[PDB]
Structures are given as structure tokens and as C-alpha cells.
């Protein structure tokens, strides 16, 4: 299941869906694990989120060119943070089209992260406009609302029952909601539940700080956010 490649770990979730794990060394804390997704669409590769650093992000591309040997069409990130947008330069240097939430690109310079080349707009229902998200294929982007951040988005993999909750949704064994610094203590539960309503056929909920859990993770996250 878990393959150690360089300094990252890769785990196959589905025939064309792989999960990558980035690690950050924090002096006095340890190694922070951040999960991501790699989806193969026929002859092209699609990546969700980057690593903690451009270096680690490039290592992912090396793995892609090794096991998949296919070119990456575009990359979509969840929110403007170093835990997901730490390798934006690597994507640009490789000539990969970066797509992110319109707000994420605005918060990027503030947080000190490189803004994406394209911006995604979302309707009142939370669904991304097809115009801003062209040739995405199975990458279905949905914006639940203010949760971990005000720009956090979720990505579902069409054709499968796999949904990426980013750093918003936590596992059913989580004790905390993770980072509550830039988080919202009012719409957190609503946003978490919105994700479950958006992708009801998704049985595999992949997060960025834990392994892919069942739909129980969504309910657990919602229950934890209900106490805010």
C-alpha cells in the first residue's frame, strides 16, 4: 500500500488514483504529514495540491514520470497555505497549468505563497463555473464555504466514489479540527455537511492530514464543528 519514494510516500487508492504524502520537519514538533491526490485521465495526469516544498513537489513529478510516465495537464490546489500550496513554483517551472480558488489567489501573496495562473469562480450553490474549470475531466470542484479557511475547496473524482476533503474534513478518530487560526467557528459545521451533500455517492473521503476514511469522517468532523 505505502511506497517510500525519496522523502515522500505514495499509496494507490484506485486504479487511476494515487495518494501522495508530504512531510515537513518542524523543530520541536516533528514531521507534519500532508496528503494529496494524483489522478490519471487516460493519457494525461491530474494532480491535486502540492507538497510542503517545491523540492518535494518536484519529487512527485519524478514519481509520476516513473510509474505513470504520462504528462501532467493541470494541477488544482485546495487553499492558500503552505500545507497545500508549498510547491507552486515547481508546477510553473514544469509548465503545468495551476488552478485555484479566486480567493486563494488573492490570499496567496498575503500568506506568502505563489498565486496560481488561473482562478476558479463558484456559484451560490458552491459549484465551480464550468467556464473557469475547463478540461478538468473527472476533477469536480466544489466550494462548501468557510471552514478551515475562507477559500478552502473540495475536489471530487467523477467516475469513482472518491472525494477529497482537503484539510477541512478530518477522520472519524480525530480529536481536534486541526488548525483553527484561519478557521471559521460558525460555518465550519455547515461547510463540512455541505461536502457530504455535494458528494453523497463518495464512500472514500480523502483528507490531507489522515488516511482515506469512510463517510463517518464527515459526520465526525461535523459533530466536532457543531461544538464550536
Residues in contact with ligand MYC by CB under 6 A are 29, 81, 83, 167, 178-179, 209
Coil, strand, or helix at residue 182?
coil
Question: Least distance (Å) from ligand MYC to the CB of residue 83?
Answer: 4
Question: Least distance (Å) from ligand MYC to the CB of residue 193?
Answer: 21
Q: What grid cell was written down for 106?
A: 488573492
CA distance linking residue 137 with residue 197, whole number of Å: 21
Q: What grid cell was written down for 219?
A: 459526520
Q: Is the dihedral of CA 131, 190, 105, 138 positive or negative?
A: negative
- Is 49 near Zn ion (CB under 5 A)? no
Q: Please say which residue, 40 or 81, places its beta carbon nearer to Zn ion.
A: 81
Answer yes or no: are the C-beta atoms of 178 and 148 closer than 8 Å. Answer: yes
- The response to whether 167 counts as a known ligand-binding position is yes
Question: Least distance (Å) from Zn ion to the CB of residue 94?
Answer: 22
Q: Please say which residue, 16 or 221, places its beta carbon nearer to ligand MYC.
A: 221
Indicate the angle between helix axes 216-226 and 188-198, nearest 10 degrees. 160
Question: Least distance (Å) from ligand MYC to the CB of residue 221?
Answer: 14
CA distance linking residue 115 with residue 171, whole number of Å: 29
- The response to whether 79 counts as a known ligand-binding position is yes
- The response to whether 81 counts as a known ligand-binding position is yes
Q: Please say which residue, 45 or 116, places its beta carbon nearer to Zn ion.
A: 116
DSSP for 24-58?
A: EEETTTEEEEEEEEEEEETTEEEEES--SSHHHHH
Q: Please say which residue, 180 or 216, places its beta carbon nearer to Zn ion.
A: 180
- The response to whether 55 counts as a known ligand-binding position is no
- Is 83 near Zn ion (CB under 5 A)? yes
Question: Least distance (Å) from Zn ion to the CB of residue 190?
Answer: 20
Answer yes or no: are the C-beta atoms of 114 and 130 closer than 8 Å. Answer: no
Q: Which of these ranges, 12-20, 55-63, 66-74, 82-90, lies near Zn ion under the rule CB under 5 A?
A: 82-90
CA distance linking residue 168 with residue 206, whole number of Å: 10
Count of other CB atoms within 10 angstroms of residue 226? 12
Element (H, E) at 136: none
Which one of ligand MYC, Zn ion, none interacts with residue 29, CB within 5 to 8 A by kind? Answer: ligand MYC
Q: Which of these ranges, 29-37, 78-86, 133-141, 154-162, lies near Zn ion under the rule CB under 5 A?
A: 78-86
Q: Which of these ranges, 16-24, 49-57, 81-89, 184-192, lies near Zn ion under the rule CB under 5 A?
A: 81-89
- Cβ burial, residue 186 (10 Å; 0-12/13-18/19+): exposed
- Is 220 near Zn ion (CB under 5 A)? no
Amino acid at each position: 500500500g505505502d511506497q517510500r519514494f525519496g522523502d515522500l510516500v505514495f499509496r494507490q487508492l484506485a486504479p487511476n488514483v494515487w495518494q501522495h504524502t508530504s512531510y515537513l520537519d518542524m523543530p520541536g514538533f516533528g514531521a507534519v504529514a500532508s496528503n494529496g491526490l494524483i489522478v490519471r485521465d487516460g493519457g494525461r495526469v491530474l494532480v491535486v495540491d502540492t507538497a510542503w516544498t517545491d523540492d518535494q513537489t518536484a519529487q512527485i513529478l519524478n514519481w509520476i514520470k516513473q510509474e505513470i510516465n504520462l504528462p501532467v495537464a493541470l494541477a488544482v490546489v485546495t487553499h492558500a497555505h503552505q500545507d497545500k500550496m508549498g510547491g507552486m513554483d515547481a508546477l510553473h517551472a514544469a509548465g503545468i497549468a495551476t488552478y485555484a480558488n479566486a480567493l486563494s489567489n488573492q490570499l496567496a501573496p498575503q500568506e506568502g505563497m505563489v498565486a496560481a495562473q488561473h482562478s476558479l469562480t463558484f456559484a451560490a450553490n458552491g459549484w465551480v463555473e464550468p467556464a473557469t474549470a475547463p478540461n478538468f475531466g473527472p476533477l469536480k470542484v466544489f466550494y462548501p464555504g468557510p471552514g478551515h479557511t475562507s477559500d478552502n475547496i473540495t475536489v471530487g473524482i467523477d467516475g469513482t466514489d472518491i472525494a477529497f476533503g482537503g484539510c477541512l474534513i478530518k477522520d472519524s478518530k480525530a480529536k481536534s479540527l486541526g488548525n483553527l487560526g484561519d478557521a471559521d467557528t460558525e460555518h465550519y459545521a455547515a461547510s463540512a455537511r455541505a461536502f457530504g451533500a455535494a458528494f453523497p455517492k463518495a464512500s472514500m473521503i480523502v483528507m490531507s492530514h489522515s488516511a482515506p476514511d469512510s463517510r463517518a469522517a464527515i459526520t465526525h468532523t461535523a459533530r466536532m464543528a457543531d461544538k464550536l
